[PDB]
Structure formats: C-alpha cells, structure tokens
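Researcher: Batch entry, complex prediction.
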Amino acid sequence: MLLAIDVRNTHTVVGLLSGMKEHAKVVQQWRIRTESEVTADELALTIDGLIGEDSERLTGTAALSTVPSVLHEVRIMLDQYWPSVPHVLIEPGVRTGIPLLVDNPKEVGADRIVNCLAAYDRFRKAAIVVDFGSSICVDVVSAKGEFLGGAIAPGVQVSSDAAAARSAALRRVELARPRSVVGKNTVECMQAGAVFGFAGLVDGLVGRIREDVSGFSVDHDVAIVATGHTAPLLLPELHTVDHYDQHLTLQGLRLVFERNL
Amino acid sequence: MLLAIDVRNTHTVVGLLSGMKEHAKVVQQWRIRTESEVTADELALTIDGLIGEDSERLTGTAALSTVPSVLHEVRIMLDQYWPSVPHVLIEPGVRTGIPLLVDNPKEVGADRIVNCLAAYDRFRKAAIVVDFGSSICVDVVSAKGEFLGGAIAPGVQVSSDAAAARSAALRRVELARPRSVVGKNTVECMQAGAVFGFAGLVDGLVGRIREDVSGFSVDHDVAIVATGHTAPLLLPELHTVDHYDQHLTLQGLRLVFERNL
Amino acid sequence: MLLAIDVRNTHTVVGLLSGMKEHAKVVQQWRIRTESEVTADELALTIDGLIGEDSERLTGTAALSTVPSVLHEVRIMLDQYWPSVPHVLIEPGVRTGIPLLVDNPKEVGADRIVNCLAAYDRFRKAAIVVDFGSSICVDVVSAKGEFLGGAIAPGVQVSSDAAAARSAALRRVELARPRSVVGKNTVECMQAGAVFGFAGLVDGLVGRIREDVSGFSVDHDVAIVATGHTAPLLLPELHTVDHYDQHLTLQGLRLVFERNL
Amino acid sequence: MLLAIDVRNTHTVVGLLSGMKEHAKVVQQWRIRTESEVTADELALTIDGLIGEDSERLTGTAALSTVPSVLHEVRIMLDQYWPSVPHVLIEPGVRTGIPLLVDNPKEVGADRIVNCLAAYDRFRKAAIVVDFGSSICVDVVSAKGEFLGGAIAPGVQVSSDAAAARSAALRRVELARPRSVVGKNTVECMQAGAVFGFAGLVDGLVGRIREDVSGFSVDHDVAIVATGHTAPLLLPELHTVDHYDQHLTLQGLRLVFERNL
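Model: Structure tokens for the complex:
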C-alpha cells in the first residue's frame, strides 16, 4: 500500500508497507543491486516488475538515496510515473523531527537520519544504532531524541574484498563464521579476522561510547539495536547489541511519510 | 651493517642492524613503497640511495617478502650487486626454529613466522603478536615455541580507503586520533571509526583468543606485543596489548640470519 | 506508430511518433541506458517492455546510432522481430538532404546531421543547435542548408562526475541549481561551478561562433535552439540561446524516414 | 633558503624562495607528479634530489597538501628530515589572517586559503582568484580580506579526458588552440570545445560573480588574477582575467610561514 525506495551505495531495498502507525508492517521487501547511472524509466520498469499488480493499489511513495545521481533519477521517476500517488523524498537539509546536534547537519546521510528516527520512535530512550551496510554506521541518539553523531567504520564485506583485492594470493572468501578464532588455514584465518574482528570492532565502539559519553553508561538505559543485511552474521558474536530490526530503515521511511502528510 | 628487508603488500621496510645477538640494534629504518612489477635495477638504486655510504660496509643481507615477484627481484639484486656479502632469504615453507603446528605450514606468511620467532626469543613464554600492516595479522605462540595460528583482519588504512572509495558521500581522510569516539563531522566520524573501531577489533581478537584457547588465559603469563607503522597510533587505545616493539620483524630477520649461518 | 531510436554514448532515447509531416507529434519518449556489449535479445526485450501494446501497431522504424555495435544489434533485432515494418538506418557518410561541407564528412556523427536537418526544417534559416548529451555539441547550419561545423565541449554531468572522482576532497554531487554563483560549501560550490560554468561555456561558444563566422552575426537572422536532457537546467542561465525543442532529434528521424521512402 | 611544498591532486610544486617579506622571490620551482601512496622517506629523497645542495642552507620549510595521505607523510618527513629547520604545515580550516566566511571552514582547501592570502597581500583589494588546477577553483576575496567562497568547476584536461574516455570514436588529443571556433573535423571541434568553451566557462563564472555579488561589479576595483599550470593556455582567450601570478601558492606559503614566526 506504501512503496518505499531505499537506495544505498551497494544495494537498493524496495518495500511494500501496509497499515498505519502502530499497525504498520512490511508486507513485502525485495533487495536488488543499485546502478549509479540507472535512469528514471529503467528504475520505474524494474519497480513495476517487482511489485506486480500492487502498482495500481499504491497509496504513497517514500524514497531516500545515498547516491545523488540515483536521487535525481528517483525525483524524475516519482514526479512522472505515479502522479496521483503522493510522494516524499528525503533530501539533506530538511528536518524530520530528529534534531541534529552535529557540526554540519546538511551532509548527514539520509539512512542515518531515518535509522535514528525509527530507533527513537521504537524505544523512546537513549539508543545506539549499528547499521551494517556498505559501511558500519554507529549512530548515537540521546534520551531527548537528538543525534549526537557517531562513527563510520568500514564494512565487513567491503574491507574483506579490499584485503583480498590488494593481494593476488588472497581470493574472494564468503563471509561466514569459522570454527574458532585461531584458524588453521588462510581461508579460516581470513574468515576469523573479518567476523570476530568486526564483532570486536562493533563491541569496542559501543563500549567506548558507553564509557566516554555521559548518559550512555551501563547505569543508564540504552537501547542498542542493529540493522542491515550483514547484521545477522555478526549478531551471535556481539556482546553489546541487544535488539535486531531488519526493517528499521523502512519503518523510518514510513514515519517520514506519515509525518509529511 | 646488516641489511634487513621486509617486503609487504603495500610498504617495504629497509633497516640497518649494528652488532650481534643482544648487541644487535637498529640504527636506521626507512619505509618506502613496493611495486609488484619493479625490477632489480630500480630496487638497487633506491636501496643505495637510502643506505648512502653503507653499501660498502654491509656484513649480511637478510630478506623476507610476501609478493613472490619482489622476492625474485631481491634475489637477483643481491646476487648481482652484492656478491661478497652473504644473504639469507626467507620464503614461506622453511623452518626458522619455530615449529608450524598448522594444517598448511607452506602457506603461512613469512612475516608471521619471523615475528613469532622474534617475540618468542624476546619473551620465552606464550606470546601474542599483533602486526598492523596491510592486513592486521594476529599470531599466537605457545609457551614452548609452537606457532598455533591467529587471524587476518583488514588493515586500518586499507579499510578506511576502501570505505572512502566505495561510498560517494565518503571521502578520503587522514588516519589520526579524533577528539572523541562520537564524531561531530564526517572527517571526525570516519577517523573515530577507523581508529577506535580497529582498536576494539584488535582487543576483541586478543580477548577471544585468550578466552577460547588453553594456556592463553588471564591467569597464565602471556606477552602481548604490537608492531607496525599504525601500531603507535592505536596503541594508547588497545587495552589487551602491553608492549610495543617497532623492530620486531627486523630483529626476527637478524635472528634468522644468525641462525642460518 | 513510428519507432524512433536515438543511440548516444550514455543514454538511448526511444520515441513513438504519431502522425506525419506537420501532424507528426511525439507522444511518448523513454530514456534508458546503453551498453556497448548488448545484443539483440535484451534490446528487443526492453524495447517491448517500454512500448507495451504499441509493438504491434508500428508503421515504420527509424534508427540513428553513434555506437557501431548497438547499430548492428538494432539491425539484427529489426530483421528478426519486425520483418514487415520498413526501416531506415542512418550512418555517417549518407546524404539526408543536408550537404556536409566538412573536410571529412564521414567522421561527422549521425546525431549532428539529424539535428541539423531537423533545425533547418523547422527554422528554414541559419541555425545554431546546442545538444546537451554525453558531450555538449554545438552545430551551425547555413541559411541555405549546409552543415559547416561547430564545437564539441564535454558534458555537464560527465565532467562534474570526473571532477568528483579525481579529487579526494570533492565528492559526488547531484547536478542542480544553487542559491548563488558563490557557494558556501563544497557541494554548493561544485553545483555552482558545474551549472553556471557550463552555461558560460555554451554562451561563449555561441558568441564566438557568431562573432568569428560570416553570416552568423547579431545583425543577421540566426535561430539558436537548445536540445538535451540537461538543457532545461541550463536554459534559465543561457542568454544566447532562444528556443528549446526537446524532441528535435526524434523529429529529425521522422523527417529522414519520410524522405528516404 | 625557504623550501615550500604544494601538493595537489595531480601535481606537486616544490619551490625554493630566497629573501623575506617584500624582498622574497621564488628562486627555483619544480613540478612533479603527485602520488597518493608515496611515503615520507621517498618524498624526502625526491625533495633532496630536486633541490641538490640547498638542503644544507634551508632556513625554513612550509607545506600544504590537498591529499590527506600525502599530508600525513609530509608530517612525518618534516618531523624527521629537517629537525633544526623550523616548519609550518597548512592543516585546512586554521586561521592564517584570512577569515573564512563559509559554512564549514574546516573543509576549505589549503590551496584556496593560501591563494586568497597571497592575492590579498599583493593587491590589498577585492580579488577573484582563478586557480587552474585539477579543477578550476574560483575564490572570491572581499575588500576587507574575507574569503567569501566561490566555485569549483571541472578542470579543462580532466573534463576533456573524461569526454574522450567515454567514447571510442573520441581519443586523447593535445590541449592546443584551434584555427577557429567552428572546426572542420572531430579533432578540431574537440579542441575548440576544450579551449574556447572553458575560456567561456571562466569568463561566465567571473562575469556572474561580478554581476550578482555586491562589491564586485564593474564600478568596483577588482583584481582578477589567474594561477596554475593551464592558466596561460586560456589566458589569450579570456576577457575578464587581468593579471597572471604563476607563483601565488608559493608566495602564500611563504606569507603563512613568515606569519607563524
């Protein structure tokens, strides 16, 4: 009933969301590769091919893009293909209800704003969002709902592919958990490094934020939530992340659409 | 008087060693780039340019490499331009006094064997060596000198560069310590990510190794020492690492040179 | 009813033309990407997906291509899938009623000749056609219908992308009009640069053409018309160009098809 | 007696400046390819090889980099190789006497700040600096010395190379002035575009700044100075550029160094 487009640097998530507010659920979600040079007509063609007969029952469209060229094409596609269907676009510089206590609010990403909005809507307290995308984005949200910033670490698959690409000896290894941390072969050592090390990266970032920033200590109530496609892989090994929400960006886009109408 | 060569994927470290056994110290160290396609001519030229008047005062030449082509070029330049000076060459698959209790001892990197030898010689107990190179290599050495294994995490600079390149909104940033873990701008966010996240990554790998492996527990006596160019930057943040030894690879090259003659 | 194909180096424009001569009006225009490696099957599939039920009502097909392989694929897909439909294929070196007064008429691109023919058909005087594609192509047409030449500057979007990619501080930016020519941040400065600078580029090329060429001065009667996707973006800024005609290349294909039967 | 390093995204300028204040002149200048991966020791070796015997007579060193990695290496090289010699480094966003009335001063390039300081020192009035770098940077300086911002347009050679690289028919041609604006073949049209269109780009940007920004109009006294390697190529074809100072960045580096003692 609602079409949500979420364009990341690596993959795009298309979602059909039905219901309103508390009853709002992601009834369907597809994940496709993104091309930076795709045009409005190609994008509308593949979106219609995905959503099938639902295209005539759409009641709204909400989109964000971290790639600016794809954001341009999304502007043209939303203005052209679904005129009667109301549309909202997440453009940097426009408030979405979450204050940005950061030096340069105009260059904060769209995904981070949406994730912070969704997390503070769900938990209504201090939160640490760990988005497992092309980068691992750690977002810190105060108890009052501000965005204090965070950290942008390299992602797991991106860093592993870069490490394998630098060395001709190393090959592209699938991201999976090994037997133990101390591997016994190059594949096992690389997998142990990427998986246990990036779990330790997330844990160290979260623990450092809790130690160094007031209001986020262990004596405080902090909702530490993961999201992103690779989050379930590192989720068992994390000791600091409590909750997991695969549709946090989609629910944030839904909240943006509901507040803009 | 001892020319120690350390060839990695991205940077090569050349050192001069004066003395022998305990009296062997590093008097001069230089860090240059590496080219997989460079030949013995340019390599001999830059070695001469770095060492100055010491080209005619060398006593021995110890080398290790990870790129096979660079190792072959080192072979040809040592056999051509330094016929009188004896050389020791370290390739993966040759014993250096540390037994390689691993499934595939042939494929273990030469830097790992050399660092394990140097750390076991220095401490004579269970050792944990973190080497911050192109890839963060974690190695564990038994209390009797057996090389068990470890992990191969992505490097700090390589991962940060990959994150900068893959993302349009992310730019290349200088690797440095920011004011806090919570960045207030994109530069500070990416710096906090690369620095504190990788400090947490190394802490996680070391802690999981100590918890999940027999003989490496807290109650045991384990020497945990970091090396590498980025090691002084991440060292104030590492909680599980005590010592720093900038010349551990060079000292291991010296030890191999003294053992192989 | 007439299937018009305009193949460029970056985007291919496919149009449906309804009517003939003065009554020929474009009702549907679709912009898709182009692939140098594409074959007839995928091209036929996307063409059919674009045109829907209109695939069975085609009267004629007109094709222009600046890529040779794409033109060959169009030949094979028209021969295979539309046997009964007459087809006109435009390649450089064949007259279309416009004498190519050029030192090497073979090297002149097909899109330039088609736009020149369309503009001389519409205006019937001296013309300056500005075509914003992969490269900003300015062409000049005499008062008697000869094609003299022009200039080929780089395109707005291609050059802005190259500027973003070649610089570490510069990031990829959505091509848009800013508040002022003087920017206050990197994104605003790059948008001001790209948009206003390429407006100045086109203005300078047109002015230099008019002043340095006989018959094109201000005292004469010359029509200056813009075409291209980015042309509506630079149109408020250009002071030399008077007219905009979005369908000029498709109308030129219609004219060529009507002439060559 | 003063060594100045100016690292840009494509070329580095090394300069020896003798004398102080008004009596300070650039006695020698070298231009080398920049390497984002170069190390401190290689950079010091090439600086010594360029400057010959002057390394033992230097009184000061001053450096800037637009590449963060090369900036890190420059930090290490200045700390290591010339310890007695005082040094100043341009970390972007730090006051040099020119206030940055920009949204985020820490992102303004080092080259822009240095060029603005040199231009205001030499001319002492409202200025427009057109740096012909890897990108054409237009910097506006108030009559009170403030840096109000400007524009970052794609560079001439980068845009021409992108346009040639997109198309197989278009090749990499020399950047020279053609016989006329209206070319007679593909090479002549491409060169006409590259030269005259970017001359028009610079002229249109400068004219729009003068028309649309208060204090910079024709009735105001404005110094319009070019700098950079490709500035003399378009200098004959420009109407708005008055002066040409080829040593603007080196003189600005000297001015910053003298202000820091």
